[PDB]
Amino acid sequence: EMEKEFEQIDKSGSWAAIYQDIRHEASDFPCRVAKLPKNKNRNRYRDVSPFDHSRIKLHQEDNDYINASLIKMEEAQRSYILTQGPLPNTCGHFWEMVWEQKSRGVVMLNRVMEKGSLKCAQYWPQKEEKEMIFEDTNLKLTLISEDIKSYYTVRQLELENLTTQETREILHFHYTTWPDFGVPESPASFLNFLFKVRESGSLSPEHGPVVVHCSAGIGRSGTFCLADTCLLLMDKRKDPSSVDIKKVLLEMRKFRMGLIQTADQLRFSYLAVIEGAKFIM
């Protein structure tokens, strides 16, 4: 199984080398809209832009820009919208997207503050009596319930379109235990978090694409999507050992750049997929 390849990369300590080749082979498409001056304040990092061909467009006649890419996995029959962590001024857009794309879940893989800095705005309400209102996109968000576990937290939020008065329930899955530096020591927690999300039905086809974010929306976000898809494939293909992580990662990078930011996260993905293959099988 790919575990063989895994143990061999380790024996050779050639991860950084395997990871680099991935970067070189990675697709490179234009990001015209993202780089336009009017959308400058709408991007978190200068080096993390969405390709034009796959960016999510807000349903605003005005400005339809939001740093977010739709990753469409044909064979796995799975789609994800990867995005950067909401900025002070793009929280309304963020929710407008969730609303227009008919998303059921939002997966957060970072803490609001990491390494003594703000990795993203507080875009959801912390107390149920203090709803939030985004006047620019005309949406209301209310905390309904919050369940705090050891490595993650699940929140039931209510999103209302103040325009149409229509209401929807968004499940917010927050992975709170990713270390400030490096990757998790054990894929155990990550895989459970993944399974929790799957169980919610947030990944299922009847709903829009699950929104997934980190700070840049490529590192931990890549890991999440890559593990999920690879597991689905091993799960539906006649020959599970035929699933190639490297080929899938490149298929994903056709939709958003930089997924998996380190040779170390790459290893961890390999790890997660393998352990997850065992818990399933």
From Swiss-Prot:
Phenotype for residue 180 to A: Substrate-trapping mutant
Localized where? Endoplasmic reticulum membrane
**Domain Tyrosine-protein phosphatase positions:** 2-276
**Main enzyme class:** hydrolase
Q: How is it modified after translation?
A: Oxidized on Cys-214; the Cys-SOH formed in response to redox signaling reacts with the alpha-amido of the following residue to form a sulfenamide cross-link, triggering a conformational change that inhibits substrate binding and activity. The active site can be restored by reduction.
Indicate where the modification Cysteine persulfide is found in the sequence. 214
Q: Which reaction does it catalyse?
A: O-phospho-L-tyrosyl-[protein] + H2O = L-tyrosyl-[protein] + phosphate
Q: Tell me which UniProt keywords the record has, alphabetically.
A: Acetylation, Endoplasmic reticulum, Hydrolase, Membrane, Oxidation, Phosphoprotein, Protein phosphatase, S-nitrosylation
Expression across tissues is: Expressed in keratinocytes (at protein level).
Enumerate the residues binding substrate: 180, 214-220, 261
* Sites of the N,N-(cysteine-1,S-diyl)serine (Cys-Ser) crosslink: 214-215
**GO terms for biological process, alphabetical:** actin cytoskeleton organization; cellular response to angiotensin; cellular response to fibroblast growth factor stimulus; cellular response to hypoxia; cellular response to nerve growth factor stimulus; cellular response to nitric oxide; cellular response to platelet-derived growth factor stimulus; cellular response to unfolded protein
Q: Which residues carry this modification: S-nitrosocysteine?
A: 214
Q: Which residues carry this modification: Cysteine sulfinic acid (-SO2H)?
A: 214
What the protein does comes down to: Tyrosine-protein phosphatase which acts as a regulator of endoplasmic reticulum unfolded protein response. Mediates dephosphorylation of EIF2AK3/PERK; inactivating the protein kinase activity of EIF2AK3/PERK. May play an important role in CKII- and p60c-src-induced signal transduction cascades. May regulate the EFNA5-EPHA3 signaling pathway which modulates cell reorganization and cell-cell repulsion. May also regulate the hepatocyte growth factor receptor signaling pathway through dephosphorylation of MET.
Instruction: Give the quaternary structure.
Output: Interacts with EPHA3 (phosphorylated); dephosphorylates EPHA3 and may regulate its trafficking and function. Interacts with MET. Interacts with NCK1.
Q: So what family is this one in?
A: Belongs to the protein-tyrosine phosphatase family. Non-receptor class 1 subfamily.
Tell me what this protein is called: Tyrosine-protein phosphatase non-receptor type 1
What is the species of this protein?
Homo sapiens (Human)
- Tell me the lineage of the source organism: Eukaryota, Metazoa, Chordata, Craniata, Vertebrata
The gene designation is PTPN1
